[PDB]
Symmetry: D2
Amino acid sequence: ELEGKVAAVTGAASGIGLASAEAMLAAGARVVMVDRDEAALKALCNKHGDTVIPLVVDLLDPEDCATLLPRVLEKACQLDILHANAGTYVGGDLVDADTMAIDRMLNLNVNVVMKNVHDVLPHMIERRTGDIIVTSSLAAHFPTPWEPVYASSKWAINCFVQTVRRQVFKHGIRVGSISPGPVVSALLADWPPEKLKEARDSGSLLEASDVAEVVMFMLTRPRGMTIRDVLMLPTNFDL
Amino acid sequence: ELEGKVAAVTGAASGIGLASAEAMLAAGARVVMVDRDEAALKALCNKHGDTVIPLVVDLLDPEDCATLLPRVLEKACQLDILHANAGTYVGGDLVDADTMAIDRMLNLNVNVVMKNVHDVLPHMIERRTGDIIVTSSLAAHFPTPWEPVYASSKWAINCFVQTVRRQVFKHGIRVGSISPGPVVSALLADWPPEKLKEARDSGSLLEASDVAEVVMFMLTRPRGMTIRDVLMLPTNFDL
Amino acid sequence: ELEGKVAAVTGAASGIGLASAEAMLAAGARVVMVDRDEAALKALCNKHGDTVIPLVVDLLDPEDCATLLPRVLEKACQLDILHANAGTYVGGDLVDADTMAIDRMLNLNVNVVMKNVHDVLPHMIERRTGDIIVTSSLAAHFPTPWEPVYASSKWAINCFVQTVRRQVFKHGIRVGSISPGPVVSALLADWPPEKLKEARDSGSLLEASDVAEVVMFMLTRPRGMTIRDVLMLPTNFDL
Amino acid sequence: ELEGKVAAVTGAASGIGLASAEAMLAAGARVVMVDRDEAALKALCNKHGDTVIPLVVDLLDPEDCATLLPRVLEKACQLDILHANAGTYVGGDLVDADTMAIDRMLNLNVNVVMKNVHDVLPHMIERRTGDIIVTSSLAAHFPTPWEPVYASSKWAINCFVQTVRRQVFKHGIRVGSISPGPVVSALLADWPPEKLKEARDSGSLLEASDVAEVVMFMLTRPRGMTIRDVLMLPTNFDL
Ligand SMILES: OC[C@@H](O)[C@@H](O)[C@H](O)[C@@H](O)CO
Ligand SMILES: OC[C@@H](O)[C@@H](O)[C@H](O)[C@@H](O)CO
Ligand SMILES: OC[C@@H](O)[C@@H](O)[C@H](O)[C@@H](O)CO
Ligand SMILES: OC[C@@H](O)[C@@H](O)[C@H](O)[C@@H](O)CO
């Protein structure tokens, strides 16, 4: 079980963040779902009763990112887990892409992730026990030619995770990430035609509910042990 | 459960291979323990009844490595899993080390691992379903200055695993590895004084029984999904 | 020689960008020095005569980053080389650092670098011949525990460079980077006390004039060949 | 110039080792060419006069690898440079390849390289000044799916080089490697049909004489600076 522990999930309104939030709830926890889409959250706040706490944060406003931390402790307190799942996608060639989404992407996939971790760590250091999981990707361990802006952001995540945990583990904290291949998501529309055609694998891609069990296996682990990364991909995906 | 599946484990006579073999047996499987030490195996063949099949193979004789495959099918058949856990250690500076152990190490940590995989794959391609797990290390993802010969071998393993699975997954096969930090083992005597002192962490290092559960989680996984690597280390180990 | 070719250098007002700009000038080229400090540039515009073109760009305003490209072609045209040397530093623990510099850093070390490349590439694709060099770091190939925010940005650069060149080389373009260890720079004040003490190596660290010769060796290279990266560090630096 | 320095080159009888040996000779040095093919060496010993010293070493006999070091000091002494260029190739799928060449390859591409370095280092530590260059490959920085056995060996080389230099640089020694893409070589016959077709690039591949100049640039470098690696590939090669 997850006893009476509290967890926060960015981008929880949909996709992996959604699957991760629902799986934590099952194990017995209050979960604070964070995303920009309140209308999407609303439907979750009721058919999930009481234990689902919504928190609307653009997360792309420096003022909003800082709202995050205290608001969690305000709304529920008892923070023991953070899951920075918030992420986007930009694929194809570098030209033919706008300067805009780029900025927005790296800031959400890198800047936001770091700031969130930076802002929630003081709590865990006083309290001791802390747990942090970042949503990485298979692109963190491969130079995928068709997503230069996306893979690079995940390479930054790879470094950041293993390096930051080296300066925090003395305070009873665990840090890790999940590096999944392609997964069913609205983000699949943001792909280029390079591959995708690959993602037509009758090896039904990866289901977002499957990675959540890995997240649980990472959380539900002897405190003495830390799982820093997990490389998972659809068996019938060529990479 | 592991139904009536059969598995083979190199270096199963002790350490991680030993923990891995025992955990498979629990899930319900015949396991072929492979190692050079028959006297060590003997004690396992009886107090583990019937389901423990011994196979004495030096594994450092080209003639013996080839004995491996048919002998498994001879002794029990029904091979669905291979675990290349056989490995050794060489630490310290490069000078002050003998040319000999080196050769012996790389051959066992690289040459033997590959040959074993090469020799058991034909079976799985005809049969379809196959599963392969290689025992890697945290050194596969770090340039540890105090074990030049050991880390490099694990970097080769990192490449080999993810690259070989790209040319086999079309035949219903899963390939992956486990990259654990330091673990209680007779190999701990082979360490230099560089760190080790680190391994005095009252964060009781890593227990070999804990990684075995990760191996099960890798095996006991939807066939559609493949876990390629798992980074685990003692929480109180600085790396 | 660099014939009548033109080059642009970000952060050219000081440090590696300064050394790189001066070395190009020697080989025979007009160089557009780009930086926020006009007063620093001014002194360079006169004691370097005619061939030094200044361009004041904050580079941390989306409106200013887009000013870059046309202004180069406006001020001098004939662009054949881009050098994205602009970068900053953030070291120490993650806590004890402000959310602000972080954002500013990743945006300059990642977002700005990409946008600059994105905006200058169309020219080279029409013209054919193009050359791009990014200033990376030794941290691009190591998880330095004491600079989590800086190393991660360089890991992104490592991916970005080798991956972007795979989708441009068909148009007669070369892309690469330089990954130097610590070098004498005003950025040395931004270091933590972790190491630095190392940088007291009577092995006089690395001189910024030495890396510039590597840049020339990268540029001054058979067009048929592309140098993608160069790992250089002070001989007496432990990493 | 290379003053009156002496250098040793493994696999110098042909290919990159051949180009490297000839380029050193030009700069002014005695060079000991090492290879299994005496008949190939013979033709070099005469039309290259006096400064070319042959040394026939199988290099795949543990007894022969140890012959190496003293014999160099026997034949010429004054060793200041070692170049471990000796290497082979194995491509295609893992099945369809023999256990034999594999063993032979990893031993020559990994075991032999290490042993050679291990055996020549004591000299340089007493003498102080030393220089070591290992012939790596682009495969050291990519998981090439069509050469599992070759790339993995180069990943080991990548670790070995940067990690070994960390425990030797205090004795006035420089260590590095060259990571070139595909190059014209008799080893081109050992390729699979996967790509090769790529190597039909009218971007004339890479010429072995071009990498030698990089080697010189690595050697001919301020002692205070060490070039640890150089990533070079044919501009019109997709990787
Ligand atoms: O939804 C994005 C996906 O989860 C990510 O993993 C990459 O797109 C994939 O790895 C391709 O490299
Ligand atoms: O028993 C060996 C250990 O399991 C291995 O993981 C390394 O020694 C460790 O990672 C140090 O880098
Ligand atoms: O000025 C910054 C320096 O050039 C950079 O290279 C890193 O600080 C160094 O590598 C430490 O890892
Ligand atoms: O002759 C071998 C070649 O030099 C090597 O570099 C690889 O074959 C190439 O990189 C393919 O990955």
